Design an enzyme around this catalytic site. Structure first.
Site, PDB file in Angstrom:
ATOM      1  N   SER A 111       3.004 -13.417  18.223  1.00  0.00           N
ATOM      2  CA  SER A 111       1.736 -14.289  18.009  1.00  0.00           C
ATOM      3  C   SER A 111       1.471 -15.597  18.712  1.00  0.00           C
ATOM      4  O   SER A 111       0.323 -15.626  19.187  1.00  0.00           O
ATOM      5  CB  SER A 111       1.483 -14.626  16.294  1.00  0.00           C
ATOM      6  OG  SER A 111       2.686 -14.626  15.731  1.00  0.00           O
ATOM      7  N   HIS A 164       0.640 -21.575  17.318  1.00  0.00           N
ATOM      8  CA  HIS A 164      -0.369 -20.668  18.237  1.00  0.00           C
ATOM      9  C   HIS A 164      -1.014 -21.460  19.361  1.00  0.00           C
ATOM     10  O   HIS A 164      -1.393 -21.119  20.251  1.00  0.00           O
ATOM     11  CB  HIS A 164      -1.378 -20.060  17.122  1.00  0.00           C
ATOM     12  CG  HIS A 164      -0.436 -19.132  16.474  1.00  0.00           C
ATOM     13  ND1 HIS A 164      -1.023 -18.656  15.103  1.00  0.00           N
ATOM     14  CD2 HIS A 164       0.910 -18.631  16.538  1.00  0.00           C
ATOM     15  CE1 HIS A 164      -0.084 -17.909  14.620  1.00  0.00           C
ATOM     16  NE2 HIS A 164       0.901 -17.881  15.472  1.00  0.00           N
TER      17      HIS A 164
END
Length: 182
Positions: A111, A164
């Site tokens: 991710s 992220h």
């Protein structure tokens, strides 16, 4: 079509690992692949990277790999195996690092790397349409969906928001820097 060796080896490895987790269970695999979670583990250097290979549901691995195939695959074919290898190792360690930092060593998945690829293909597209690389309109929208789902914890995507953005920053830095050199 057909996807390059870095793109392909990484999909295989994420699959092989996911299978291992289905067989042995998650903790057993984590025990071996996670960010060092005790001082006695700090010199086991694969663990600073191999957290990227473990996924915790069918959705997590499915969407991570769709993005990886499409974007990691594009980057590899147009701009080389070495570029993709470098985006991946930096984004893997930096998001690993921030995750670790804020919420402890138990985490996994590609991710962070995918966010680096999204930011990289997008900003390269905007700053250098000339290299062969852009994120399509439609896809921008689905990237945003995928991001929003993560950010507001709509689908349990292993890593926090803090990690992220670290991933994104790397993709942008590197796009930024590549579009300076051309």
């Amino acid at each position: 079509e057909r996807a390059g060796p870095v793109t392909w080896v990484m999909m295989i490895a994420c699959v092989v690992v996911f299978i291992a987790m289905q067989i042995l269970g998650d903790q057993e695999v984590m025990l071996w692949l996670a960010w060092p979670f005790d001082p006695t583990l700090k010199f086991e250097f694969w663990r600073y990277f191999t957290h990227a290979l473990m996924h915790f549901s069918l959705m997590h691995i499915l969407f991570n790999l769709l993005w990886w195939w499409y974007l990691g695959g594009a980057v590899e074919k147009r701009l080389g195996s070495g570029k993709l290898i470098v985006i991946t190792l930096i984004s893997a360690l930096l998001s690993g690092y921030v995750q670790q930092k804020f919420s402890g060593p138990w985490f996994g998945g590609l991710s962070g790397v995918v966010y680096a690829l999204m930011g990289y293909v997008w900003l390269r597209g905007e700053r250098d349409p000339q290299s062969g690389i852009y994120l399509q309109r439609g896809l921008i929208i689905f990237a945003l969906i995928w991001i929003v789902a993560g950010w507001f914890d709509l689908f349990g995507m292993s890593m926090a928001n803090g990690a992220h953005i670290a991933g994104l920053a790397v993709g942008l830095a590197m796009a930024f820097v590549d579009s300076l050199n051309a």
